[PDB]
DNA sequence: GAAATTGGCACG
DNA sequence: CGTGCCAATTTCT
């Protein structure tokens, strides 16, 4: 019970300023959505990740 | 106490003292407690030691000695930039909370 | 609601008056952990 | 054991370096072969890692069907496969000094067993022992495409397979060396380093030994274009898998294990870490049937990269060797690439979740968390 | 009373501005002179407010302009 | 109790 | 002289 509560109390202090400030940052660079297949089984598919 | 036979940090004790005392006569002062450290601290001057600390730093060359001189410089950064002094760490007026 | 002295009173006397307005103030817990720093020697202070 | 597919497509390979064996099959040299399964309609959906010195039944691009076996591998055997064919020629091992005679009591399939540093003579200290390639006319078969001739050299506890001089061809290995929960996302977050870090190497490159003893074992890296002359040092009392023969990429294991963070981030970039991250912690969170979105580990993520360290002061401000705040540097060099000057260069920091909120632009913030004495 | 207020944000555009502007107007129609634009049932200043909003009857700039235009003529008035 | 930082010592 | 391992100390549930 406390562990959780210990975890979540630091999670929220190291992010508790991050707001959405703006509406456009001008760049257009990202992450390359792929799912996740372990080798036997594709565990999510694409539809849920973007 | 002068470069003459002891440094300027060095520590002495009871029998130690007395036979300083016997050595030399003047320019050589001992003191114990807060208002040594006192003494330490306002004889201090920031800048020369700034200076000696840069070049000790960029002719030298080590890492661990690197970092301990740049710990330092730091903080004498710090010290000159803002207003503080360094003998403000030894307390001689004690503020007392409202009741 | 909870700290802020004047402004306790300032809300009660407008929830009876019909108006539902607030003047926030500053809380008195605030003052007390200044006063409390600054009494260990360490200059804290508002400024502007 | 042996990869199974489960599946009907078609097999493809990458980052493999193969060759046809004596037998027939295709037997792979590269450690960082994978294998993927891909259908009609071009998607991937399967993901094998294929070790060092494997067996392939099928080829890249072939056909094949369900409940197929399509590679099989020895695990408990480290194969020194060769890539030509030919005899083999003995040379610089001596028999006490480097290498040792043992012989199987029940079997009785010997070979002399090659000793290691720490065990065999001084005088076998300094040389170093290697099975060389040869050919009938007694000259030394050259790799093809390469020019550095075929010799292979070997460490310790290195098990000889065949006598000198039988006849040998690819797919023959020269010698056999013998080898959650809560927490995990608490560690993960706050980018904790394990116990035995997967230690890595900094810069791609041929590759090859050094001094011994040390200390530990040291290493040599020498790029096909860039500056050689950097050395690691490489613990020799845990298992190596480094192949001092082989050319190798920058972002690659020497030992194995878990890799720590910090590492990663250093030496394959900040798109990397950002997935191994969220992959690491959505695999805790997954296998509970919790479900959560992305964007919630990606923004604490880049709540974690908000450092940066100088490594030289520039035309900027900043002196040589401080941590600064990464919008300051990317806002002075923005300033200054729009105007004619130039800016400083900066390396990224990764910090655990309760390191990268103490060290805040606010003290009023940071006292509150924790240490409020040693931050007032 | 009112259980939703999704064509208040839709009107609007935002759900943090249209808690500023429905208070705004619920504030003066409590401790102002003002009447409500609607057909007032048993309602308080604030759902009378948000009705108001769903009709297109008050925004930002309906307000400010009210507002100008009062100043305008109380200036006059008082010469 | 666990983990991170600091001072002391063996070693090359 | 310069590195790295080991004991002390501190802070946190």
Request: net charge negative; hydrophobic share 35%.
């Given at each position: 019970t406390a562990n959780s509560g210990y975890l979540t109390r630091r999670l929220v202090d190291v992010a508790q300023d991050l707001?959405?400030?703006?509406?456009?940052?001008?760049?257009?660079?990202?992450?390359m959505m792929t799912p996740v297949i372990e080798g036997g089984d594709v565990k999510e598919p694409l539809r849920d990740r973007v | 106490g002068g470069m003459t036979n002891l440094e300027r940090q060095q520590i002495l004790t009871e029998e130690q003292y007395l036979d300083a005392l016997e050595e030399f006569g003047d320019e050589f002062d001992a003191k114990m407690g807060a208002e040594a450290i006192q003494a330490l601290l306002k004889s201090m001057?920031?800048?020369?030691?700034?200076?000696?600390?840069?070049?000790?730093?960029?002719?030298?060359?080590?890492?661990?000695?690197?970092?301990?001189?740049?710990?330092?410089?730091?903080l004498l950064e710090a010290f000159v930039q803002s207003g503080n002094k360094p003998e403000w760490m030894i307390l001689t007026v004690l503020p007392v909370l409202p009741p | 609601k909870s700290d802020d002295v004047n402004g306790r009173t300032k809300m009660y006397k407008n929830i009876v008056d019909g108006n539902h307005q607030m003047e926030p103030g500053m809380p008195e817990s605030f003052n007390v952990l200044l006063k409390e720093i600054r009494s260990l020697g360490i200059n804290i202070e508002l400024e502007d | 054991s042996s990869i199974q597919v489960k599946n009907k497509g078609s097999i493809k390979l990458s980052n493999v370096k193969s060759v046809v064996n004596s037998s027939g099959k295709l037997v792979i040299t590269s450690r960082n072969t994978e294998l993927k399964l891909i259908d009609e309609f071009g998607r991937t959906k399967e993901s094998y890692k294929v070790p060092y010195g494997a067996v392939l039944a099928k080829g890249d691009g072939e056909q094949v069907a369900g409940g197929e076996t399509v590679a099989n591998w020895?695990?408990?055997?480290?194969?020194?496969?060769?890539?030509?064919?030919?005899?083999?020629?003995?040379?610089?091992?001596?028999?006490?000094?480097?290498?040792?005679?043992?012989?199987?009591?029940?079997?009785?399939l010997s070979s002399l067993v090659v000793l290691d540093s720490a065990e065999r003579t001084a005088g076998g200290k300094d040389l170093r022992p290697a099975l060389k390639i040869v050919?009938?006319?007694?000259?030394?078969?050259?790799?093809?495409?390469?020019?550095?001739?075929?010799?292979?050299?070997?460490?310790?506890?290195?098990?000889?397979?065949?006598?000198?001089?039988?006849?040998?061809?690819?797919?023959?290995?020269?010698?056999?060396?013998?080898q959650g929960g809560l927490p995990r996302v608490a560690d993960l977050f706050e980018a904790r380093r394990p116990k035995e870090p997967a230690i890595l190497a900094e810069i791609s490159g041929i590759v090859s030994f050094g001094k011994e003893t040390k200390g530990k074992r040291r290493l040599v890296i020498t790029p096909v274009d860039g500056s050689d002359p950097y050395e690691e040092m490489i613990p020799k009392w845990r298992q190596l898998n480094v192949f001092e023969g082989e050319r190798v990429e920058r972002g690659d294991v020497i030992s194995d294990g878990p890799e720590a963070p910090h590492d990663i981030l250093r030496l394959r970039g900040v798109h990397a870490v950002t997935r191994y991250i969220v992959n690491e912690?959505?695999?805790?969170?997954?296998?509970?049937?919790?479900?959560?979105?992305?964007?919630?580990?990606?923004?604490?993520?880049?709540?974690?990269?908000?450092?940066?360290?100088?490594?030289?002061?520039?035309?900027?401000?900043?002196?040589?060797?401080?941590?600064?705040?990464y919008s300051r540097v990317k806002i002075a060099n923005r300033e200054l690439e729009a105007n004619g000057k130039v800016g400083a260069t900066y390396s990224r920091d990764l910090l655990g979740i309760t390191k990268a909120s103490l060290a805040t632009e606010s003290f009023i913030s940071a006292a509150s968390f924790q240490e409020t004495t040693r931050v007032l | 009373?009112?259980?939703?207020?999704?064509?208040?944000?839709?009107?609007?555009?935002?759900?943090?501005?249209?808690?500023?502007?429905?208070?705004?107007?619920?504030?003066?129609?409590?401790?102002?002179?003002?009447?409500?634009?609607?057909?007032?049932?048993?309602?308080?200043?604030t759902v009378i407010a948000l009705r108001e909003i769903e009709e297109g009857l008050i925004n930002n700039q309906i307000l400010d302009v009210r507002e100008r235009q009062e100043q305008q003529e109380q200036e006059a008035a008082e010469l």
């Open positions: 707001v959405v400030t703006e509406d456009d940052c001008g760049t257009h660079e990202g992450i | 001057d920031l800048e020369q030691e700034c200076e000696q600390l840069r070049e000790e730093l960029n002719e030298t060359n080590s890492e661990t000695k690197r970092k301990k001189l740049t710990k330092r410089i730091k | - | 020895d695990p408990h055997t480290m194969p020194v496969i060769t890539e030509v064919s030919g005899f083999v020629r003995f040379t610089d091992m001596i028999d006490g000094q480097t290498i040792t005679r043992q012989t199987d009591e029940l079997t009785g050919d009938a006319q007694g000259n030394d078969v050259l790799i093809p495409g390469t020019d550095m001739p075929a010799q292979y050299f070997l460490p310790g506890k290195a098990i000889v397979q065949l006598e000198d001089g039988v006849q040998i061809s690819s797919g023959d290995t020269l010698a056999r060396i013998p912690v959505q695999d805790v969170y997954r296998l509970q049937g919790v479900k959560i979105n992305d964007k919630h580990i990606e923004v604490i993520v880049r709540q974690m990269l908000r450092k940066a360290t100088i490594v030289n002061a520039g035309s900027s401000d900043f002196l040589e060797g401080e941590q600064v705040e | 009373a009112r259980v939703t207020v999704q064509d208040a944000v839709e009107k609007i555009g935002n759900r943090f501005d249209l808690v500023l502007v429905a208070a705004r107007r619920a504030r003066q129609m409590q401790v102002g002179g003002k009447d409500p634009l609607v057909p007032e049932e048993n309602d308080k200043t």
